[PDB]
Structure 1
Amino acid sequence: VGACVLCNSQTSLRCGACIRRPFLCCKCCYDHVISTSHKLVLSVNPYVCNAPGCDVTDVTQLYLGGMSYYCKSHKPPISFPLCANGQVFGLYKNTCVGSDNVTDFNAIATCDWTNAGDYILANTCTERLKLFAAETLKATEETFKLSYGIATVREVLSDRELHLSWEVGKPRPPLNRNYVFTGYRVTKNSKVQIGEYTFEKGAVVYRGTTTYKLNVGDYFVLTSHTVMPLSAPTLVPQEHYVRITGLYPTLNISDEFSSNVANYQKVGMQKYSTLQGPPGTGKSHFAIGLALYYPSARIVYTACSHAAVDALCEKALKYLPIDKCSRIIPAVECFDKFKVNSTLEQYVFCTVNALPETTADIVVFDEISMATNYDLSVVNARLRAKHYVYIGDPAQLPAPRTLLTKGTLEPEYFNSVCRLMKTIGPDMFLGTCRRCPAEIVDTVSALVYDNKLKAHKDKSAQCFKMFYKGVITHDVSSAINRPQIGVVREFLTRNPAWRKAVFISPYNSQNAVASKILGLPTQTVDSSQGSEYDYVIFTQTTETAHSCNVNRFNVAITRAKVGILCIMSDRDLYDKLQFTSLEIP
């Protein structure tokens, strides 16, 4: 028994064909089964023919006879159809409201999540269907991971370099960072974990979490997880106040946090607030300063990634008493300078998935662009807070959507928070970039920030762009542009100072070839998010949707403190770069 995900009406029915088995009311179950392929219905029991070796499961071909379910062919003379009167038969028949249209629910229930349109719907439907969609998508993502073949160590060539044998009649996952494996040793009658791993083309390179002397018949699978049901909204109902509520402003604050005093007061005067922090504008400084402005406030700092949490930890360690901080860790190497798993500590740093059920004066949820609606709901379920602050940048990268192949995901569809920030605007904006030369700031100010982002630094004059398509080769899941690397090679010979540069591209394969040819450290745009370097060399590699995506371009060029070389495939983004043009040697 439970609540219908369309009406809320009490019900004894779940759709057995839906992967999350959502409770549907007599009417909503009916409208769902007759307008889709979903015909298996579950109650206290499953609506299936309780006849011996009858296969009939379709509820519309089934009848209650006695206290058992039968099809047409096996039913007793005294029976009634389970599925008639615009209703499916279960408890609480007399309390059932229905809906005008069941169309959004059916689309969520039946879509394969390969098209942007599925995520648009998941983010504009009713709040109750946002949760259904978020569960459904996530269960679908975890199942897609099982669809991948096992990789088995066929030969150890060296340290860090292997030969894999792949399970026949199942696809191989992409060999990039967005696919994290887990090793396993063959035991008497079982298997035991041996740390997570990632692979890249060579033979394959592997950069595992822990170190080992792994040997033949050792195997690797992407760890999939049980997805729990969601209950809490993606956002609590908003409230505006006429005074700061449940918080006590400090009387003395350092001129280090004085720029955020108005913002800090705004946090205290509504239930939740959104802070758009562009690259290098002081998001973690904001987040910790909030503790100093409200010194008695119990604050839970959360984010999706251990790295995002640890960065809040590093910033805390420098401003907050260490004995008032705790890092929550469940039973990967993260931040180890705070007492571990002390929930009742004033300052709690903890990833979304490991959050305890607790209260707080303020919840700071950082790197919000990377959050899914699933994450947003979990936080609301675990943390009852007086104030929620959502910090991030809808102009930066979202969580990879492993299943999305067709269409682009616009930032207003990344999650409910980014939706608000893109529709009504952010509550608070960090308007001054301290990281980047003015050429980069000016470029992205106009590209994605509506000319509201201001440079601290002057022009560097070390910001260059070259228009060069070169030559694109494709391997199994990546792109390579050797001539764009050649242009970088010739540039470096005439500009040896740039040998301190980081190499960035939209493709792991481009990066692997650049690494060998240039010896620069490499990053994907996606892995560079949150990092900064003095000098950046960027090869666009292709002009795909992937490589021209404005959020990815934005992250790519805002990594640079001093200089950047952009080797561009795309005339559009080339013409938007406010950088000195260089001809081709």
Structure 2
Amino acid sequence: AVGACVLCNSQTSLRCGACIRRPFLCCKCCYDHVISTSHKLVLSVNPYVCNAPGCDVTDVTQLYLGGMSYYCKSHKPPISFPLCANGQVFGLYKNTCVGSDNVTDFNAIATCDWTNAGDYILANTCTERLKLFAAETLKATEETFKLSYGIATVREVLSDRELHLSWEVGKPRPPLNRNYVFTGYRVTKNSKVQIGEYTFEKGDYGDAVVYRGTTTYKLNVGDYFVLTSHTVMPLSAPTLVPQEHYVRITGLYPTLNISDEFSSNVANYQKVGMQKYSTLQGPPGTGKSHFAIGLALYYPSARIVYTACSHAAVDALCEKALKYLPIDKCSRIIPARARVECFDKFKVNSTLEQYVFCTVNALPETTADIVVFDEISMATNYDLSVVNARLRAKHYVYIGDPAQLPAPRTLLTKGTLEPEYFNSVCRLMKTIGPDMFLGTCRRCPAEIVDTVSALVYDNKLKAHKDKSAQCFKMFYKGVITHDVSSAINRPQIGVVREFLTRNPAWRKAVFISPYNSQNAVASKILGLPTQTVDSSQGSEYDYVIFTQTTETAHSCNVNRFNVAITRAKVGILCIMSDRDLYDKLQFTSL
């Protein structure tokens, strides 16, 4: 086990102790790192400790070679030499240690807390390998943090599906959703065995919680549900492959006279062909995933695999491909858990298909010819190089929109993050511009595009359809809990329930609630087509119902609302609590 360094990339085999990921360092690089930072532990073919059992010094600052092992001064043998070299650290290979000085950024990477936007923006500015290491250590930090989550010291259970949840004091009791993974542990003085992969969501009403596990007993009193963390694997492939310009087509099979909306985009498709790859930077709603299926129609011959960030986007892509492309050449890869539903009509995880679909975390390690990825804003730089490593094709396509909301990055609790610095690809998109751009929101008519282009977007956007005259508003406030218990505006639900009858075609209007509790309680009361923004990302609906609960940095986000309204087709009705935000748009009040 020997490798290159990182700052200087010289051949060496030293690693740091305090650095969580334990990376390979040369001699001079390691010496600089341990001089600067407080890291006082170095790993090699053996650990570094005072070999004398009467000492327990692990500091590399002083350690004396006791014949073959390390010693303190109080145990140093007479004929012996300290192993702190002449401005380096003694060890494996010294005669081939090339010099490099950019250690300060690397020291900061192993220093900062990822609570300040300076950390994240600085992370996406260093060397490629440093970027990979920073992403890896950030992921590990997140895993460690979520590991230290609530230990639910419950007391009661309602039914075979429903239970009562209570928690310990001191650690963060995490929220409940199908996304998270929990498991109880039978404390019977012994046999603390897993009770199964237990997911949890809040019940319908009152102090009630619905529980579903891989096994399902009738749970006892003394158990607890602790959130465990999954490991993070290292990576080697670059985040971004280099660009190469061509002259002729790169070996793709066309289809003459297939459609019409994409013959105009044939020039764009050839522009993709003349390079190793290409990207897409444009507003949501306007030929994004739709510029995709027609491009496939241009060269529908090779055996290909695709994917998407979230499940709704890939399911909509599957439906669109079924609508346009033949069915029996496309597939969608499903995960083992599959607790969140998917396109439950198609092939059940058929990796042996010509145009395959999947999710980010369940991608295989096979290859293809071309590929397209969904919503670079929702993704990090880690998963980019992850798919680069597992998948290697001859052409790559990337889609995304800077105005969209980025990945959660919950540890960053200070400041806002500039859209370019969402990932490396977004920075490149905002610096060098797009590869091809489409700007005419096709699903929403002219009034919505006017509102979005006048208020948040640049006054450049246009549409193809005239006003549908289904714009209405509401402003009255309502009351919430105000003491934790994320805001729930029940009077608005009651007024919606009382009113809805007058609105005939709005019975199936897609209800929107980013907050999980409100999202559940709305369906609990009436059963509207409930939905959250996060999960509306890249979707689209004829009738939508948006509901703002209260005012907060979350609910007052410009990007959240503008990505919420880009999903209007023919009809919508939504409510506020904020005055100037109510006045900002250009619709009818009522």
- Report the TM range for the smaller structure's normalisation: 0.7 to 0.9
> Taking structure 1 as reference, are residues 533 and 308 closer, same or farther at Cα in structure 2, changes over 3 Å only?
closer
> Taking structure 1 as reference, are residues 482 and 37 closer, same or farther at Cα in structure 2, changes over 3 Å only?
farther
Structure 1 position 482, deviation (Å): 4.4
> Taking structure 1 as reference, are residues 431 and 167 closer, same or farther at Cα in structure 2, changes over 3 Å only?
same
> Taking structure 1 as reference, are residues 313 and 539 closer, same or farther at Cα in structure 2, changes over 3 Å only?
closer
Give the whole-Å Cα distance in 1 for the aligned partners of 2:56 and 2:452: 61
> Taking structure 1 as reference, are residues 342 and 464 closer, same or farther at Cα in structure 2, changes over 3 Å only?
closer
Structure 1 position 163, deviation (Å): 0.4
Query: 1:173-205 CA distances to partner (integer Å, 9 max, x unpaired)?
Result: 12356645456788998677777555444x324
Structure 1 position 415, deviation (Å): 1.4
Structure 1 position 57, deviation (Å): 1.6
Query: 1:416-446 CA distances to partner (integer Å, 9 max, x unpaired)?
Result: 1222223323212232223223322222234
1:153, 1:162 within 8 Å by CA — same for their partners in 2? no
Give the whole-Å Cα distance in 2 for the aligned partners of 1:106 and 1:572: 46
User: How high is the TM-score relative to the length of structure 1?
Assistant: 0.87
Give the whole-Å Cα distance in 2 for the aligned partners of 1:567 and 1:339: 40
> Taking structure 1 as reference, are residues 267 and 512 closer, same or farther at Cα in structure 2, changes over 3 Å only?
same
**Partner residue, 2:84:** 83
More strand by share: 1
Structure 1 position 452, deviation (Å): 4.0
Query: 1:331-371 CA distances to partner (integer Å, 9 max, x unpaired)?
Result: x6545666666656432323333333333221211232221
Indicate the larger mover: 180-189 or 376-385. Answer: 180-189
Indicate the larger mover: 236-245 or 209-218. Answer: 209-218
Indicate the larger mover: 153-162 or 125-134. Answer: 153-162
Indicate the larger mover: 143-152 or 503-512. Answer: 503-512
Give the whole-Å Cα distance in 2 for the aligned partners of 1:74 and 1:415: 52
Query: 1:186-226 CA distances to partner (integer Å, 9 max, x unpaired)?
Result: 8998677777555444x324577998876766754445211
Unpaired stretches in structure 2, ≥5 consecutive residues: 203-207
- 3-state secondary structure, aligned to 1:186: coil
**Partner residue, 1:317:** 322
> Taking structure 1 as reference, are residues 78 and 465 closer, same or farther at Cα in structure 2, changes over 3 Å only?
farther
1:440, 1:578 within 8 Å by CA — same for their partners in 2? no
Give the whole-Å Cα distance in 2 for the aligned partners of 1:116 and 1:497: 45
Indicate the larger mover: 518-527 or 387-396. Answer: 518-527
Give the whole-Å Cα distance in 1 for the aligned partners of 2:341 and 2:525: 31
> Taking structure 1 as reference, are residues 45 and 316 closer, same or farther at Cα in structure 2, changes over 3 Å only?
farther
**Partner residue, 1:403:** 411
Query: 1:141-185 CA distances to partner (integer Å, 9 max, x unpaired)?
Result: 111121013336643324653202334543211235664545678
Indicate the larger mover: 364-373 or 338-347. Answer: 338-347
**Partner residue, 2:570:** 562
Give the whole-Å Cα distance in 2 for the aligned partners of 1:340 and 1:518: 33
Structure 1 position 62, deviation (Å): 2.3
- 3-state secondary structure, aligned to 2:307: strand
Indicate the larger mover: 130-139 or 556-565. Answer: 556-565
> Taking structure 1 as reference, are residues 6 and 502 closer, same or farther at Cα in structure 2, changes over 3 Å only?
same
Indicate the larger mover: 337-346 or 31-40. Answer: 337-346
**Partner residue, 2:514:** 506
1:5, 1:132 within 8 Å by CA — same for their partners in 2? no
> Taking structure 1 as reference, are residues 337 and 489 closer, same or farther at Cα in structure 2, changes over 3 Å only?
closer
> Taking structure 1 as reference, are residues 346 and 52 closer, same or farther at Cα in structure 2, changes over 3 Å only?
same
- 3-state secondary structure, aligned to 1:86: coil
Structure 1 position 227, deviation (Å): 0.2
- 3-state secondary structure, aligned to 2:371: strand
> Taking structure 1 as reference, are residues 465 and 166 closer, same or farther at Cα in structure 2, changes over 3 Å only?
same
Q: Percent identity, aligned pairs only?
A: 100
> Taking structure 1 as reference, are residues 175 and 335 closer, same or farther at Cα in structure 2, changes over 3 Å only?
closer
Structure 1 position 103, deviation (Å): 2.5
1:506, 1:546 within 8 Å by CA — same for their partners in 2? no
Query: 1:214-267 CA distances to partner (integer Å, 9 max, x unpaired)?
Result: 676675444521100121122112223233323233323222543532332222
Indicate the larger mover: 399-408 or 475-484. Answer: 475-484
> Taking structure 1 as reference, are residues 307 and 560 closer, same or farther at Cα in structure 2, changes over 3 Å only?
closer
Structure 1 position 388, deviation (Å): 0.9
> Taking structure 1 as reference, are residues 523 and 296 closer, same or farther at Cα in structure 2, changes over 3 Å only?
closer
> Taking structure 1 as reference, are residues 155 and 385 closer, same or farther at Cα in structure 2, changes over 3 Å only?
same
The alignment status of 1:36 with 2:46, answered yes or no, reads no
- Alignment equivalent of 2:551, drawn from 508, 524, 543: 543
Query: 1:69-113 CA distances to partner (integer Å, 9 max, x unpaired)?
Result: 223333323444444533223323222234333222222222222
Give the whole-Å Cα distance in 2 for the aligned partners of 1:111 and 1:241: 43
1:327, 1:336 within 8 Å by CA — same for their partners in 2? no
1:526, 1:552 within 8 Å by CA — same for their partners in 2? no
1:60, 1:83 within 8 Å by CA — same for their partners in 2? yes
Structure 1 position 59, deviation (Å): 1.5
Give the whole-Å Cα distance in 2 for the aligned partners of 1:272 and 1:477: 47
Structure 1 position 13, deviation (Å): 1.2
Give the whole-Å Cα distance in 2 for the aligned partners of 1:23 and 1:213: 50
Structure 1 position 524, deviation (Å): 2.6
> Taking structure 1 as reference, are residues 318 and 545 closer, same or farther at Cα in structure 2, changes over 3 Å only?
same
User: How high is the TM-score relative to the length of structure 2?
Assistant: 0.87
Structure 1 position 518, deviation (Å): 5.7
> Taking structure 1 as reference, are residues 318 and 513 closer, same or farther at Cα in structure 2, changes over 3 Å only?
closer
1:246, 1:386 within 8 Å by CA — same for their partners in 2? no
Structure 1 position 458, deviation (Å): 1.6
> Taking structure 1 as reference, are residues 232 and 447 closer, same or farther at Cα in structure 2, changes over 3 Å only?
farther
Q: How many residues align?
A: 580
Indicate the larger mover: 284-293 or 141-150. Answer: 284-293
2:445, 2:466 within 8 Å by CA — same for their partners in 1? yes
Query: 1:359-388 CA distances to partner (integer Å, 9 max, x unpaired)?
Result: 322121123222111110111111222111
Query: 1:517-551 CA distances to partner (integer Å, 9 max, x unpaired)?
Result: 56534323222223333333333333322222232
- Alignment equivalent of 1:264, drawn from 260, 269, 279: 269
1:174, 1:477 within 8 Å by CA — same for their partners in 2? no
1:408, 1:545 within 8 Å by CA — same for their partners in 2? no
Indicate the larger mover: 473-482 or 210-219. Answer: 210-219
Give the whole-Å Cα distance in 2 for the aligned partners of 1:438 and 1:238: 38
Give the whole-Å Cα distance in 1 for the aligned partners of 2:505 and 2:315: 32
Give the whole-Å Cα distance in 1 for the aligned partners of 2:346 and 2:466: 39
1:291, 1:299 within 8 Å by CA — same for their partners in 2? no
Give the whole-Å Cα distance in 1 for the aligned partners of 2:539 and 2:194: 31
> Taking structure 1 as reference, are residues 188 and 571 closer, same or farther at Cα in structure 2, changes over 3 Å only?
same
> Taking structure 1 as reference, are residues 53 and 494 closer, same or farther at Cα in structure 2, changes over 3 Å only?
farther
Give the whole-Å Cα distance in 1 for the aligned partners of 2:239 and 2:164: 44
> Taking structure 1 as reference, are residues 406 and 485 closer, same or farther at Cα in structure 2, changes over 3 Å only?
farther
1:178, 1:400 within 8 Å by CA — same for their partners in 2? no
Give the whole-Å Cα distance in 2 for the aligned partners of 1:578 and 1:198: 43
Give the whole-Å Cα distance in 2 for the aligned partners of 1:341 and 1:533: 27
- 3-state secondary structure, aligned to 1:422: helix
CA RMSD of aligned residues (A): 3.3
2:455, 2:585 within 8 Å by CA — same for their partners in 1? no
> Taking structure 1 as reference, are residues 523 and 221 closer, same or farther at Cα in structure 2, changes over 3 Å only?
farther
**Partner residue, 2:396:** 388
